[PDB]
Amino acid sequence: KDPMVSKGEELFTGVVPILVELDGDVNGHKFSVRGEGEGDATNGKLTLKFICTTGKLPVPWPTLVTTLVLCFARYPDHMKQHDFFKSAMPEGYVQERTISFKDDGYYKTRAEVKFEGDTLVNRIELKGIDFKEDGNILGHKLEYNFNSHNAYITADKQKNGIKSNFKIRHNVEDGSVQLADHYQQNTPIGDGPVLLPDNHYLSTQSALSKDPNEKRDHMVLLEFVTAAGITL
Incomplete structure (x- = not known):
């Protein structure tokens, strides 16, 4: 839509600082x-x-x-x-x-x-x-x-966005599990070519670690997120 200005998915083809x-x-x-x-x-x-x-x-x-x-x-x-x-x-x-x-x-x-x-x-x-x-x-x-x-993930058509409902399972030190029920809404700040998806899901894996040289309270995080649920 503009070959001279990267927008949307074109901003993510390489490595992006966060x-x-x-x-x-x-x-x-x-x-x-x-x-x-x-x-x-x-x-x-x-x-x-x-x-x-x-x-x-x-x-x-x-x-x-x-x-x-x-x-x-x-x-x-x-x-x-x-x-x-x-x-x-x-x-x-x-x-x-x-x-x-x-x-x-x-x-x-x-x-x-x-x-x-x-x-x-x-x-x-x-x-x-x-x-x-x-x-x-x-x-x-x-x-x-x-x-x-x-x-x-499900479309939220009236708000031109998406919603998500999911439960996170946190392992407790005594061997039990602590549930954290997530109610999520996303709405665009602009109003460009926004894509309202068919139902699908995001599959997420996370690894937490410590930096042995970091004195402050901290979390090192590696995380993978991949979309699935619609057939090729």
């Missing part, structure tokens, strides 16, 4: 997180490092993974017309969630995902309400790991 900034308030504990790295949508790959820039993170790092850039999913060639996330770029989209932790509190998140220059930027405000002081979150009882999940 900046993430989150400011959070959980039960009145206010904190900030900054992440940086790169995305390789051709391979569905994210490599990021996140630092809590205010001190110790008052919630477990795994509980923030889904909040801390689905435009880097690898959509198969026969599914490219269903990629809402890239089609909104560079102007971007708003991603909102409520995440309810079973038998504990909830997060509300609002984020803008858009290009700032050559960098894909995810800026987030997070509010956490009703957490138990001796629960798995404020008590830091969740294992430092992450399971693989599927997130089913």
Whole structure:
């Protein structure tokens, strides 16, 4: 549509720098997180490092993974017309969630995902309400790991966007599982050629690690995201 200005999926054919900034308030504990790295949508790959820039993170790092850039999913060639996330770029989209932790509190998140220059930027405000002081979150009882999940995507025609409902399973240190029910909405910031997809899902795998030379509270993240569910 413009051979002289890359738009939509054309912005993601190579390796793209990423900046993430989150400011959070959980039960009145206010904190900030900054992440940086790169995305390789051709391979569905994210490599990021996140630092809590205010001190110790008052919630477990795994509980923030889904909040801390689905435009880097690898959509198969026969599914490219269903990629809402890239089609909104560079102007971007708003991603909102409520995440309810079973038998504990909830997060509300609002984020803008858009290009700032050559960098894909995810800026987030997070509010956490009703957490138990001796629960798995404020008590830091969740294992430092992450399971693989599927997130089913459906069009939200009235808002020209998409929705998603899915449950994250967080391993607890006692061998139990802590469910985190995600209600997600995405709406474009602009109004260009936005693609409203047929039903499909995103398959996601994550690996968490530590940087042995990093003094600050932090999370190193490798993540893969791949679209599926429509037949060739």
